[PDB]
Amino acid sequence: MISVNDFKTGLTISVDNAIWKVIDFQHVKPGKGSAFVRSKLRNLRTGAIQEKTFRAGEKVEPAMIENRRMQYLYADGDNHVFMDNESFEQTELSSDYLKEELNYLKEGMEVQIQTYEGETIGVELPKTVELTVTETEPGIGATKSATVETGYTLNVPLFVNEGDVLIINTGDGSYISRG
C-alpha cells in the first residue's frame, strides 16, 4: 500500500468502503514527532468531497480503475450488450442500471465504461446524439412536445415534423437543432 510520506495529487485509493481520488493534500510534521497526511478526496461514484486523515504507519489501500472504449451493439430484452473495441469481450448491462442513459443510447454508439474490481462504476455517452421524431403534432419562440425513437419526450420548435432527425444534448436533455 501507499505510505503517508509518498502521496501525490491524483492517486486513486479505497477507504471507508468508497473509492476516491486525491484532489489536494498536506503532509503534516507535528513539532518534532511522527508525520501524517490531511487529504481532500473526491468520491469516484458521486462527486462528493470529504477530508480524510491518514496517520503514520497506516498503509492506504490503492484502487485500480479500468477505462475501456466500447461499442453498444444491441438490446436483448432487458440486456444491453456492449463490445470491447480491443478485445471483443462482451459485457451485459441492465435497463435498471442504465435508466437515464437509455433516453439517448442507440445501436452503434461508442461509449467509455469504467470498472473497479468487477463493478461497473460509470458509462460516459457522446456529448450529443441524433434521434428521430416518432410522434408530434403536424406543422401548420413557441414550442410543442415531441417523442423520439428511444421513448424520450422533449420540447421542440413548431416547425419540427415527424421523421425529423434531432440533435440533442445528453447532459441536459435539450434540443439543439435538426440534422
CATH number of the domain enclosing 49: 2.30.30.30
Pair 131, 152: CB distance under 8 Å = yes
Residue 95 amino acid letter: S
| H/E stretch holding 78 | none
68/39 Cα distance (integer angstroms): 29
Of 128, 129, 132, residue with least CA distance to 146:
132
64/5 Cα distance (integer angstroms): 20
Indicate whether 57 and 78 sit together in one domain.
no
Cell numbers that stand for 120 in this block:
461497473
CA 18 to chain centre: 17
Which ranges constitute the DSSP H helices of 21-157?
none
Domain of residue 101 covers: 64-127
The bridge status of strand 66-76 relative to strand 110-116 is antiparallel
Pair 107, 74: CB distance under 8 Å = yes
Dump strand ranges (E) for 29-164: 36-43, 49-54, 61-62, 66-76, 79-84, 90-94, 110-116, 119-124, 128-136, 143-148, 153-157
CATH, residue 173:
2.40.50.140
Q: Helices H, strands E: what count in the chain? A: 0, 15
- Residue 11 vs residues 20, 116, 160: alpha-carbon distances, Å: 8, 15, 49
175/47 Cα distance (integer angstroms): 27
Query: Number of folded domains in the chain?
Result: 3
80/94 Cα distance (integer angstroms): 6
Indicate whether 96 and 49 sit together in one domain.
no
Indicate whether 172 and 143 sit together in one domain.
yes
Cell numbers that stand for 85 in this block:
473495441
Resolution (A): 1.5
Phi-psi region of 25 (alpha: psi -120 to 50; beta: other; left: phi over 0): beta
24/26 Cα distance (integer angstroms): 7
166/178 Cα distance (integer angstroms): 5
Indicate whether 55 and 71 sit together in one domain.
no
Indicate whether 133 and 177 sit together in one domain.
yes
What is the rounded (10 degree) CA torsion for 140, 144, 145, 148? 60
For the chain, give percent helix, strand, coil, nearest 5: 0, 55, 45
83/178 Cα distance (integer angstroms): 30
What experiment produced this structure? X-ray
Pair 176, 126: CB distance under 8 Å = no
164/125 Cα distance (integer angstroms): 22
Of 122, 82, 115, residue with least CA distance to 100:
122
